[PDB]
Amino acid sequence: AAMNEFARKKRALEHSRRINAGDLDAIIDLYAPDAVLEDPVGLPPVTGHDALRAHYEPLLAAHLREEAAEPVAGQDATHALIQISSVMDYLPVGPLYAERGWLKAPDAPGTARIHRTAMLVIRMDASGLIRHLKSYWGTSDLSPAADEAARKQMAVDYAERINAGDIEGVLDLFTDDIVFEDPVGRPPMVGKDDLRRHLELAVSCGTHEVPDPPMTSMDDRFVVTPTTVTVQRPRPMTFRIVGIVELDEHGLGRRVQAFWGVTDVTMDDR
Amino acid sequence: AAMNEFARKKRALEHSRRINAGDLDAIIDLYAPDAVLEDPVGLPPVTGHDALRAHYEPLLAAHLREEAAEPVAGQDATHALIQISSVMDYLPVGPLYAERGWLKAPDAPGTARIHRTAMLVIRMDASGLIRHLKSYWGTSDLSGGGPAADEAARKQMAVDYAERINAGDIEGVLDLFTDDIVFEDPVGRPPMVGKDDLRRHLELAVSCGTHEVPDPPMTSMDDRFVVTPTTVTVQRPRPMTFRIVGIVELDEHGLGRRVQAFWGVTDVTMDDR
Amino acid sequence: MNEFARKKRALEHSRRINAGDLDAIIDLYAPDAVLEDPVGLPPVTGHDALRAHYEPLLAAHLREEAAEPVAGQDATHALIQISSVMDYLPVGPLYAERGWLKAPDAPGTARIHRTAMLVIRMDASGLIRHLKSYWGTSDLSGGPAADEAARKQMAVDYAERINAGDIEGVLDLFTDDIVFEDPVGRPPMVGKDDLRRHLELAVSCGTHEVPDPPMTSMDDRFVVTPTTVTVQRPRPMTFRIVGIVELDEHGLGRRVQAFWGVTDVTMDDR
Amino acid sequence: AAMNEFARKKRALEHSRRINAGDLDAIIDLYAPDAVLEDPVGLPPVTGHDALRAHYEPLLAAHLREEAAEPVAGQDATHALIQISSVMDYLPVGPLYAERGWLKAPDAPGTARIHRTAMLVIRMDASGLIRHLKSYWGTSDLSGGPDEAARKQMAVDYAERINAGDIEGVLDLFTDDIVFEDPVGRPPMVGKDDLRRHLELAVSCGTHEVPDPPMTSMDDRFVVTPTTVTVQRPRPMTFRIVGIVELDEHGLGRRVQAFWGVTDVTMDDR
């Protein structure tokens, strides 16, 4: 059913539970034998249980503690998305972050901590095992200051423009080449003409968008934005959505994926 | 006299001694608070105790161990040079090397190791603290991808120098350098400029009967420098033997533009008795 | 601008190039038009910059031999394959500088042979808004191919694997992120599951692919493959197609655009 | 060797005279058969009469006219330096300049012109034949079109500080590796201790420097500065000097060459 949406969202939360629990066998158990992990998105991906154990053991050693937001489901029978707020001891991974220039080295590495906020995109198979997990976070999500954090601005510009009914200003945020899915799981659309019809539909039933602060991938190719969205017609409803936008060399929107599930809509009535 | 020379050499060995010991505070103690580190030369430099700890902690974590050759001193009251052979766990720095294309990632990273040979050029102040440390190594000085490609083409410049000058082929040696060449030998005395000065140095060299035997060279990461430890003997005015390390900065076309021959008074041996 | 008009216009462009008149050429471009030649270099904009780009070529007596264009099913695109020959002077020296070409011994008599794919976007009046010219170092003579030759290999592999029906071997050529339009103008397919269903249909209808030698962009991020494709079912048909594939870090297929027009399908054989 | 300073300075002007004359054979005759030309410094050099004809014919074709300043000599029996202001028709070279990004292409190429100001550094052999000619100019020296103009500022900073007696601030403009000739023909000094002493004599004799607007190489590695310099001790004298400074990664001066001839010292000026 669309009850399997709940299954994926449950497994998503279980992942966070097992991390906080610290049991490494319990964590690896959630993964297919051949799963693929990108953390953070932009680093070369990593494959197989051995590599997972290698990635997760130092984190568990740093007493990583995760606070999970409410997941949302994709309408594709595989995906659940979940935002995480992390804290860990700066050692032993901190130094590697600094060595990559992601983080300014602390004065007292034995007492420093590392705070992170990331978006987890988890692709599961019918048995609920994780096949591919993407963790989206960049330097502005670690312990809005780069010329590349104004690429986070593109999330504010979209919502602000669309709430005003400024369709052309929305269309300007994207390449003429634009591919978009909304919801992820239904056939996608291409080019600013389809998008215009999508957005004209949106304005007419009265949609209103409110983003939470976005995250980026590490290479700033991607901007991840949780929004809450309301519509008036054909029924007052509220949607919990997380939208991923891939950017081109000029900061234009190349691809958009709006993740929200049937269990992410509320028929509010007041 | 050259007593400060031994101080620096001893300190160079102590640095390696503290690495193998694994105590990170002991290591940072050898460094001035504003010290500058380039490891490998070619990567943008790094400054201050905080950045040093970020650099040394993952290395120590990989149980890095060092075998040091016996240092040489520079004749300027600051410099000591020392060759190092390292081995460390592939994790956690290995992945960082693989990302940069310095390395081909191994098929069992959890048990793999990384061998490196480098030349450390250490500048100390009058108190013996490190002010500036340059670590010379490149892709052909790294086990994981000896892939001597066009880096081997620049390492050949070391073999040519020794072979040609041993043969007295002064002009073939001069062909190895820019007409702009700057040449200190020893470092700490005023250098010569241009191939006319260089020719006379080399004419002198051949006449005193100098004979060079180089160790295998190292390069920087960007292959702009070629580091060559040599042993050199001369017959006149006195049979002597020098332990030298020569650093050559190359130009766009691989020509030798700047050369620094590091050796101290305590790196010479009087022979034939 | 139906499919026929756009194709005819593509040849007209090549005709005016052979005609040698620079004014006639610029007349075909919107005043704010954009040119990329080769794809991978920064673009060029506006009639003034266009004159700067074409004048040295025309002085070198550039003569093009054009293949039959194909149309995109999107009311804007015509694509056309080009073979060039021109004097080595005055641009050849500039190519040698960039490492694209080995300087010749008798530059006063040398020629430059080039094969490129022109992707031409026209607006409704038939003026060119955006022109992309795909050619790389292995498509220039006066080929080398170092890693281009392995990324060019990806086209030979696709056709060969799919001809044998090795569906899973085909999927391995692409990322899980894959976007596949086929034809451009109909809604695209997302993910290897869509792609599997597409490839199963392809295999079942008896598709057989025969590629011309591919081209790349200059940065080898794109591989352009003209193929002739025949199917047996539901009828023996023949498609004239050109495929543009965007590659990632590891030479995998990120996005695929298969251009072919309604007027590019016949009931022939080969 | 032969060719005194007056001889070399006159040959410098004769070269320019023959350029304006338009006879290509006459120009080439001034060059050794194996001579080397760099125009501009930063591009690969060209060698031998044959390449030279190839370099000069398009320039003469655009009716290149030169206004030559008064040369200076090097005190080394080989070098003469001379500043040139060029003008030529935009065709035939202009389009190629624009292709490399040195120029914004004009609207009317058949009437446009190209203005250039460069410093020619000419090495002649004992017969007065040119062995090596370097032409220093960059985009900021071309009627294009300021690039890393902050790299041109190092001339104003040098002059202002040494005029003020601010030795340490002057020394701050150079690497500790600094190699300094002054005049070219006298043995060079290395390192800031030597340079400090040189500058102390300079300040004690009351030197005062007035720079003309500098030029750069194309790759902005070199800053060429014509100055007139006056001293008060032991007699009030005036020097016509042109200084070449090679910069490092961070814009520090790594090598400096002060060209001035025995015939460039006068008793005149204010």
Side-chain angles (χ1 to χ4, degrees), chain C residues 37 44 49 52-54 56 94 98, chain D residues 94-103:
Chain C
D37 187 21
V44 157
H53 185 80
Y54 278 103
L94 202 163
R98 303 171 161 159
Chain D
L96 292 149
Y97 283 178
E99 274 295 301
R100 300 174 152 118
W102 305 351
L103 228 44

Side-chain angles (χ1 to χ4, degrees), chain C residues 32-43:
Chain C
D32 61 320
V34 171
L35 165 60
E36 306 188 58
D37 187 21
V39 163
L41 291 205

Side-chain angles (χ1 to χ4, degrees), chain B residues 180-182 191 193 224 249 252 257-258, chain D residues 177-179 188 190 221 246 249 254-255:
Chain B
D180 216 351
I181 177 64
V182 178
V193 194
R224 224 168 58 167
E249 200 195 334
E252 303 205 357
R257 214 164 183 242
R258 293 179 131 102
Chain D
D177 207 353
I178 181 63
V179 177
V190 200
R221 303 221 329 110
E246 202 184 328
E249 312 201 353
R254 206 158 178 232
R255 301 175 105 108

Side-chain angles (χ1 to χ4, degrees), chain C residues 17 26 39 42 58 73 75 91 94 113 119 122-123 137 184 198 213 216 220 256 258:
Chain C
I17 298 267
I26 271 71
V39 163
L58 293 185
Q73 268 166 92
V91 301
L94 202 163
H113 314 83
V119 188
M122 294 152 278
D123 74 330
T137 43
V184 165
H198 175 79
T216 55
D220 300 3
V256 165

Side-chain angles (χ1 to χ4, degrees), chain A residues 160-231:
Chain A
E160 187 164 358
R161 295 217 224 301
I162 196 177
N163 289 347
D166 181 13
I167 289 201
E168 295 305 324
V170 172
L171 292 165
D172 289 331
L173 293 161
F174 304 95
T175 81
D176 299 67
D177 195 38
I178 182 65
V179 171
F180 62 98
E181 315 180 59
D182 183 15
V184 158
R186 273 208 46 84
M189 320 266 140
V190 194
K192 298 196 196 185
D193 297 318
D194 269 6
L195 186 53
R196 204 181 322 262
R197 283 190 292 283
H198 187 78
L199 295 163
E200 283 167 334
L201 282 191
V203 174
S204 62
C205 40
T207 86
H208 182 63
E209 296 220 7
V210 171
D212 307 338
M215 302 126 270
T216 60
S217 62
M218 189 51 80
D219 55 5
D220 290 358
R221 209 161 291 204
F222 298 85
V223 178
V224 181
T225 320
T227 36
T228 309
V229 178
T230 60
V231 307

Side-chain angles (χ1 to χ4, degrees), chain C residues 87-99 101 103-104 107 112, chain D residues 44 100:
Chain C
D87 304 327
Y88 175 83
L89 301 179
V91 301
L94 202 163
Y95 289 162
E97 271 217 46
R98 303 171 161 159
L101 191 143
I112 295 176
Chain D
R100 300 174 152 118

